[PDB]
Motif scaffolding. Structure first.
Motif, PDB file in Angstrom:
ATOM      1  N   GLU A  34      -6.130   1.751   5.515  1.00 30.63           N
ATOM      2  CA  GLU A  34      -5.940   1.808   6.978  1.00 30.63           C
ATOM      3  C   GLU A  34      -4.868   0.852   7.489  1.00 30.63           C
ATOM      4  O   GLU A  34      -4.108   1.197   8.384  1.00 30.63           O
ATOM      5  CB  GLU A  34      -7.255   1.632   7.729  1.00 30.63           C
ATOM      6  N   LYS A  35      -4.787  -0.320   6.878  1.00 31.15           N
ATOM      7  CA  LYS A  35      -3.773  -1.302   7.227  1.00 31.15           C
ATOM      8  C   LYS A  35      -2.371  -0.755   6.904  1.00 31.15           C
ATOM      9  O   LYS A  35      -1.442  -0.937   7.673  1.00 31.15           O
ATOM     10  CB  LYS A  35      -4.040  -2.607   6.468  1.00 31.15           C
ATOM     11  N   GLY A  36      -2.233  -0.059   5.779  1.00 28.67           N
ATOM     12  CA  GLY A  36      -0.942   0.494   5.380  1.00 28.67           C
ATOM     13  C   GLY A  36      -0.443   1.560   6.332  1.00 28.67           C
ATOM     14  O   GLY A  36       0.761   1.675   6.575  1.00 28.67           O
ATOM     15  N   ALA A  37      -1.384   2.330   6.872  1.00 24.99           N
ATOM     16  CA  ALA A  37      -1.077   3.384   7.826  1.00 24.99           C
ATOM     17  C   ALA A  37      -0.489   2.863   9.131  1.00 24.99           C
ATOM     18  O   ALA A  37       0.268   3.596   9.775  1.00 24.99           O
ATOM     19  CB  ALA A  37      -2.323   4.213   8.128  1.00 24.99           C
ATOM     20  N   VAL A  38      -0.828   1.623   9.528  1.00 21.21           N
ATOM     21  CA  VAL A  38      -0.353   1.056  10.819  1.00 21.21           C
ATOM     22  C   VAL A  38       0.717  -0.047  10.715  1.00 21.21           C
ATOM     23  O   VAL A  38       1.099  -0.616  11.735  1.00 21.21           O
ATOM     24  CB  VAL A  38      -1.537   0.549  11.697  1.00 21.21           C
ATOM     25  N   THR A  39       1.234  -0.299   9.508  1.00 26.08           N
ATOM     26  CA  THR A  39       2.229  -1.364   9.285  1.00 26.08           C
ATOM     27  C   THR A  39       3.656  -0.823   9.242  1.00 26.08           C
ATOM     28  O   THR A  39       4.028  -0.111   8.307  1.00 26.08           O
ATOM     29  CB  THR A  39       1.930  -2.129   7.975  1.00 26.08           C
ATOM     30  N   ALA A  40       4.470  -1.223  10.215  1.00 24.83           N
ATOM     31  CA  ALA A  40       5.853  -0.735  10.323  1.00 24.83           C
ATOM     32  C   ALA A  40       6.873  -1.413   9.413  1.00 24.83           C
ATOM     33  O   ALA A  40       7.758  -0.746   8.898  1.00 24.83           O
ATOM     34  CB  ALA A  40       6.322  -0.839  11.766  1.00 24.83           C
ATOM     35  N   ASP A  41       6.774  -2.732   9.244  1.00 23.61           N
ATOM     36  CA  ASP A  41       7.740  -3.476   8.413  1.00 23.61           C
ATOM     37  C   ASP A  41       7.707  -2.936   6.985  1.00 23.61           C
ATOM     38  O   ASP A  41       6.644  -2.857   6.370  1.00 23.61           O
ATOM     39  CB  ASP A  41       7.454  -4.988   8.443  1.00 23.61           C
ATOM     40  N   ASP A  42       8.888  -2.579   6.478  1.00 23.59           N
ATOM     41  CA  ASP A  42       9.027  -1.965   5.162  1.00 23.59           C
ATOM     42  C   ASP A  42       8.458  -2.820   4.029  1.00 23.59           C
ATOM     43  O   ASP A  42       7.643  -2.330   3.241  1.00 23.59           O
ATOM     44  CB  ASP A  42      10.503  -1.635   4.878  1.00 23.59           C
ATOM     45  N   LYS A  43       8.894  -4.082   3.950  1.00 21.87           N
ATOM     46  CA  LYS A  43       8.433  -4.993   2.889  1.00 21.87           C
ATOM     47  C   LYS A  43       6.930  -5.310   2.964  1.00 21.87           C
ATOM     48  O   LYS A  43       6.266  -5.347   1.925  1.00 21.87           O
ATOM     49  CB  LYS A  43       9.284  -6.273   2.803  1.00 21.87           C
ATOM     50  N   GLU A  44       6.388  -5.504   4.167  1.00 24.63           N
ATOM     51  CA  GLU A  44       4.935  -5.737   4.308  1.00 24.63           C
ATOM     52  C   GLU A  44       4.134  -4.477   3.925  1.00 24.63           C
ATOM     53  O   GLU A  44       3.016  -4.560   3.419  1.00 24.63           O
ATOM     54  CB  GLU A  44       4.563  -6.142   5.730  1.00 24.63           C
ATOM     55  N   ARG A  45       4.726  -3.311   4.159  1.00 27.80           N
ATOM     56  CA  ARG A  45       4.070  -2.065   3.856  1.00 27.80           C
ATOM     57  C   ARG A  45       4.160  -1.844   2.327  1.00 27.80           C
ATOM     58  O   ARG A  45       3.221  -1.336   1.710  1.00 27.80           O
ATOM     59  CB  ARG A  45       4.695  -0.922   4.673  1.00 27.80           C
ATOM     60  N   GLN A  46       5.272  -2.268   1.718  1.00 25.26           N
ATOM     61  CA  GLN A  46       5.427  -2.164   0.268  1.00 25.26           C
ATOM     62  C   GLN A  46       4.335  -2.980  -0.438  1.00 25.26           C
ATOM     63  O   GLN A  46       3.685  -2.472  -1.349  1.00 25.26           O
ATOM     64  CB  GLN A  46       6.822  -2.625  -0.205  1.00 25.26           C
ATOM     65  N   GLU A  47       4.122  -4.218   0.002  1.00 24.09           N
ATOM     66  CA  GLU A  47       3.095  -5.089  -0.595  1.00 24.09           C
ATOM     67  C   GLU A  47       1.684  -4.496  -0.533  1.00 24.09           C
ATOM     68  O   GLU A  47       0.922  -4.632  -1.477  1.00 24.09           O
ATOM     69  CB  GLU A  47       3.103  -6.491   0.038  1.00 24.09           C
ATOM     70  N   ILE A  48       1.364  -3.814   0.565  1.00 25.22           N
ATOM     71  CA  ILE A  48       0.045  -3.202   0.739  1.00 25.22           C
ATOM     72  C   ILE A  48      -0.183  -2.071  -0.266  1.00 25.22           C
ATOM     73  O   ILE A  48      -1.222  -2.031  -0.932  1.00 25.22           O
ATOM     74  CB  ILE A  48      -0.165  -2.689   2.188  1.00 25.22           C
ATOM     75  N   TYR A  49       0.766  -1.150  -0.381  1.00 22.45           N
ATOM     76  CA  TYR A  49       0.581  -0.061  -1.339  1.00 22.45           C
ATOM     77  C   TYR A  49       0.678  -0.542  -2.800  1.00 22.45           C
ATOM     78  O   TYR A  49       0.104   0.086  -3.691  1.00 22.45           O
ATOM     79  CB  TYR A  49       1.464   1.142  -1.020  1.00 22.45           C
ATOM     80  N   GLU A  50       1.355  -1.661  -3.040  1.00 20.78           N
ATOM     81  CA  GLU A  50       1.369  -2.241  -4.401  1.00 20.78           C
ATOM     82  C   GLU A  50      -0.025  -2.749  -4.759  1.00 20.78           C
ATOM     83  O   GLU A  50      -0.504  -2.494  -5.875  1.00 20.78           O
ATOM     84  CB  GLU A  50       2.425  -3.322  -4.565  1.00 20.78           C
ATOM     85  N   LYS A  51      -0.700  -3.398  -3.809  1.00 18.26           N
ATOM     86  CA  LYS A  51      -2.047  -3.871  -4.075  1.00 18.26           C
ATOM     87  C   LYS A  51      -2.980  -2.713  -4.308  1.00 18.26           C
ATOM     88  O   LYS A  51      -3.836  -2.793  -5.173  1.00 18.26           O
ATOM     89  CB  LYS A  51      -2.614  -4.803  -2.979  1.00 18.26           C
ATOM     90  N   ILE A  52      -2.819  -1.646  -3.532  1.00 21.82           N
ATOM     91  CA  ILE A  52      -3.653  -0.439  -3.669  1.00 21.82           C
ATOM     92  C   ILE A  52      -3.489   0.159  -5.069  1.00 21.82           C
ATOM     93  O   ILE A  52      -4.484   0.430  -5.749  1.00 21.82           O
ATOM     94  CB  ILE A  52      -3.358   0.588  -2.552  1.00 21.82           C
ATOM     95  N   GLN A  53      -2.238   0.283  -5.515  1.00 21.38           N
ATOM     96  CA  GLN A  53      -1.937   0.801  -6.859  1.00 21.38           C
ATOM     97  C   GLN A  53      -2.539  -0.125  -7.904  1.00 21.38           C
ATOM     98  O   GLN A  53      -3.138   0.328  -8.880  1.00 21.38           O
ATOM     99  CB  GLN A  53      -0.414   0.984  -7.081  1.00 21.38           C
ATOM    100  N   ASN A  54      -2.387  -1.425  -7.692  1.00 23.68           N
ATOM    101  CA  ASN A  54      -2.975  -2.412  -8.596  1.00 23.68           C
ATOM    102  C   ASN A  54      -4.498  -2.382  -8.627  1.00 23.68           C
ATOM    103  O   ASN A  54      -5.077  -2.434  -9.710  1.00 23.68           O
ATOM    104  CB  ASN A  54      -2.438  -3.818  -8.301  1.00 23.68           C
TER     105      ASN A  54
END
Length: 488
Positions: A420-440
């Motif tokens: 849910e946090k990834g869905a509402v985060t606009a900054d590219d790099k902050e959004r990259q970190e979120i989906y990296e954790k999800i994949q991890n």
């Protein structure tokens, strides 16, 4: 050096040829020829649209259209069609399967036609994935569907009016769909004059039709590739289908709740061997890593992959507390040679780590009823696959606790907060970190076992050129058939 016909082989009948509802392979394949999108999905390039502009606050998306566009019946194609299409999807009575992409916290996106060539979308809250929704959008004509109460059932879908390179001519049930070139197609007058989609189910028969020139283009199964290549003059094209082939571990079965057991069943396997056994060689699939395919933003192959270690696997099954006395079940499709070979490989590999696996091949309908039921605990493992798109937010329905396609039945509130946090985060790099954790997290918890990112294969009669320009792509074979040409 102009005109000519192209016959394309498909496997079944299309359903409703209307982009507000099209979801199966055949219908989408035909739709690609009849309707043009705002932007081409495969690369995000301008199609009917000239450009997309996103405001600094990320709430306003402005799309500018090309000038002088028309539909197949000569009526202009303008912003009013885009506005009408979005309102027709938002309208709950129409039951459009894509409605969810235009709604956020139950609030709809607002859309407005500033001019004939300008559409302005105003979101209620920030939603980065909405850029992708704009890039996978095919408008429908307002002059045709305005005032129609049930668009999906309307007889107007029997003679679809589009903006794509090929106009609809006619449809013979169970036999073919014929089309003819649209001269005012926005990207240039098509080179081939007629395109026919030929419906032939039996592959031995279909491949023979291809050899005898009765079919000019079709998809080929990996096992048939050497047969068709030497049978006639055809160019074989292999490209990524953005499909992940994977195994799910059903956490509704108490034993699979153990992270250790799931990891043991990962460490017992080797991807190059699975690929080798499923498809014939490595030209048809590459070893997977992440639960996301390579086309999806923020994809990273730097996740745990549990590279084959049978000795360590034996250690984990011990620590698990799993009583080897018990037997596990692998459920898969009974009409897929790939899935049976994968199954036997798992059985073989699990035997070697002291785990007994029973193969349970099943009928497709029955398999849906089993795996589409979130309370079912009959299957220990289920083989599946998906083609999810370019934004990782679309994958939520396969991993959220409450999701209907969460085959593993994995329940993790913290991970769901990240989604849910990834869905509402606009900054590219902050959004990259979120989906990296999800994949991890998914990889670390061995929720599934990603096997391979699969390729699709086409055979195209050697007399036809322009395959590079037509762009092979997932699902529909080509992006734009107007680029193909016949060299007689």
């Amino acid at each position: 050096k102009d005109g000519g016909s192209l016959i394309i082989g498909v496997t079944g009948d299309p359903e409703v040829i209307n982009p507000n509802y099209a979801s199966d392979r055949v219908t989408l394949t035909i739709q690609q020829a009849v309707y043009a999108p705002l932007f081409w999905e495969v690369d995000g390039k301008p199609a009917l649209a000239k450009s997309l502009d996103i405001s600094d606050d990320n709430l306003t998306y402005t799309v500018k259209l090309k000038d002088g566009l028309t539909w197949h019946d000569g009526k202009p194609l303008t912003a009013d069609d885009v506005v009408f299409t979005v309102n027709s999807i938002l309208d709950t009575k129409q039951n459009s399967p894509n409605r969810g992409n235009f709604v956020f916290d139950d609030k709809p996106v607002k859309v407005e036609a500033v001019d004939d060539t300008t559409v302005k979308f105003t979101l209620p809250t920030v939603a980065p994935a909405f850029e992708n929704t704009i890039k996978t959008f095919f408008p429908i004509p307002k002059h045709i569907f305005e005032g129609v109460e049930n668009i999906e059932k309307s007889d107007k879908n029997k003679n679809p009016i589009g903006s794509g390179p090929y106009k609809f001519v006619e449809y013979k049930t169970g036999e073919y769909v014929s089309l003819e070139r649209f001269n005012d197609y926005f990207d240039g007058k098509p080179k081939l004059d007629k395109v026919t989609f030929r419906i032939t189910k039996d592959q031995n028969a279909a491949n023979l039709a291809l050899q005898n020139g009765e079919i000019n283009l079709k998809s080929i199964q990996p096992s048939d590739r050497n047969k068709v290549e030497k049978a006639s003059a055809v160019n074989i094209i292999t490209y990524p289908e953005n499909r992940l082939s994977y195994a799910t571990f059903n956490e509704n079965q108490p034993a699979l709740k153990s992270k250790e057991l799931r990891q043991a069943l990962s460490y017992a396997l080797d991807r190059e061997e699975i690929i080798d056994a499923a498809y014939g060689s490595d030209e048809y699939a590459k070893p997977a890593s992440s639960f996301l395919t390579e086309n999806t933003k923020y994809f990273t192959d730097k996740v745990e992959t549990y590279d084959q270690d049978i000795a360590k696997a034996k250690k984990l099954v011990k620590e698990s507390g799993f009583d080897t006395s018990q037997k596990l079940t692998v459920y898969y499709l009974n009409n897929s040679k790939s899935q049976e070979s994968i199954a036997l490989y798992l059985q073989q590999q699990y035997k070697e780590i002291g785990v007994t696996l029973d193969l349970k091949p099943t009928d497709p309908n029955a398999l849906s009823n089993i795996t589409l039921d979130r309370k079912n605990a009959d299957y220990s493992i289920a083989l599946n696959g998906y083609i999810m798109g370019n934004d990782p937010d679309a994958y939520k329905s396969l991993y959220l606790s409450d999701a209907p396609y969460n085959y593993s039945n994995y329940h993790n509130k913290d991970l769901d907060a990240l989604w849910e946090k990834g869905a509402v985060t606009a900054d590219d790099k902050e959004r990259q970190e979120i989906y990296e954790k999800i994949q991890n997290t998914i990889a670390d918890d061995a929720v599934i076992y990603p096997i391979s990112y699969d390729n699709a294969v086409l055979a195209l009669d050697s007399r036809y050129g322009g395959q590079k320009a037509a762009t092979p792509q997932p699902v529909t074979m080509f992006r734009d058939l107007s680029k193909l040409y016949l060299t007689e």
